[PDB]
């Protein structure tokens, strides 16, 4: 149930230098949903003005 | 009826409306105590929930599932509402496609003349498959023949059209209020 070797791994991607950044964007979720819940609704009522 | 591919809020609204409709149907069949209905009425309620289960199907599957650990002559609402909800969501016993009924009737009409004799229909319904009772056959003959006392043959096309229209009207009437219904918090 374990003597299988069908899987073949991918390549050996070379990429080099520039590393990860610091902790910057942790508190930016203040208005993530609200804007999506607001910007969408701000003009989502623009259709009963049609029928 | 119940849409199984709508939004989560729509899913909850549909489930609540279906539960309320099942409760209303149960109350319509409630005679002595709320929460218990006669076993014989189990398929009948399904026919308002959009399900047309066969007698054999209900006896073999519906009855054992609805029945509690011990066989009881009355089905409690507690074991009736959830099973009804899942059955309706799965559309297990929904009536077949009207095209299927037309194909069956044309198969019955070997010559393809567009009509079937009343005696032939009676023999087919009373000798093959799950035989109908006398009142079942009488009602089927009366309503297929639009309550015509002088009718000698039944035209399957118009009878099927009328039955489908009546079923659609009944379903819409029973579904009435879903737009105004809201999820209870």
């Amino acid at each position: 149930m374990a003597l299988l070797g069908k899987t073949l791994k991918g390549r050996s991607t070379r990429p080099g230098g520039i590393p990860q950044k610091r902790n910057i964007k942790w508190r930016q979720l203040a208005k993530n949903q609200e804007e999506f819940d607001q910007l969408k609704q701000l003009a989502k009522m623009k259709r009963e003005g049609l029928k | 009826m119940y849409d199984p591919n709508t939004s989560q809020t729509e899913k909850q609204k549909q489930e609540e409306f279906l539960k309320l409709k099942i409760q209303e149907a149960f109350n319509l069949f409630v005679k002595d105590k709320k929460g218990i209905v006669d076993k014989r009425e189990i398929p009948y309620i399904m026919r308002y929930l959009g399900q047309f289960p066969s007698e054999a199907q209900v006896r073999d599957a519906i009855l054992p599932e609805i029945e509690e650990d011990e066989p009881s002559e009355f089905i409690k609402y507690s074991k009736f509402e959830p099973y009804m909800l899942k059955v309706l969501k799965e559309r297990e016993y929904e009536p077949d496609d009207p095209e299927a009924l037309l194909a069956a009737f044309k198969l019955l009409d070997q010559e393809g003349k567009g009509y079937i004799e009343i005696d032939m229909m009676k023999t087919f319904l009373e000798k093959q498959g799950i035989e109908f009772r006398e009142q079942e056959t009488k009602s089927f003959i009366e309503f297929a023949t639009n309550k015509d006392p002088n009718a000698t043959v039944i035209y399957y096309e118009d009878y099927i059209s009328r039955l489908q229209a009546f079923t659609d009207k009944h379903i819409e009437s029973v579904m009435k209020g879903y737009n105004n219904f809201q999820v209870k918090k």
Binding site: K40, L42, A43, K44, M45, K46, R47, E48, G49, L50 | D3, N5, T6, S7, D97, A100
Partner: protein, 52 residues
Amino acid sequence: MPPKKAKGKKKKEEEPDDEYKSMTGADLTQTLEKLKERVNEMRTNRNYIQMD
């Protein structure tokens, strides 16, 4: 035999980002007034041309 239609995933359409997503309520009442009678200017042009 019946080839049962595949239970394809329902619409749940992503609302197009067309011009319908611009302004708030009061200007929606104004736009209302801006497309509330006339389109039957056109339907009535249809009707009168049909009568002729």
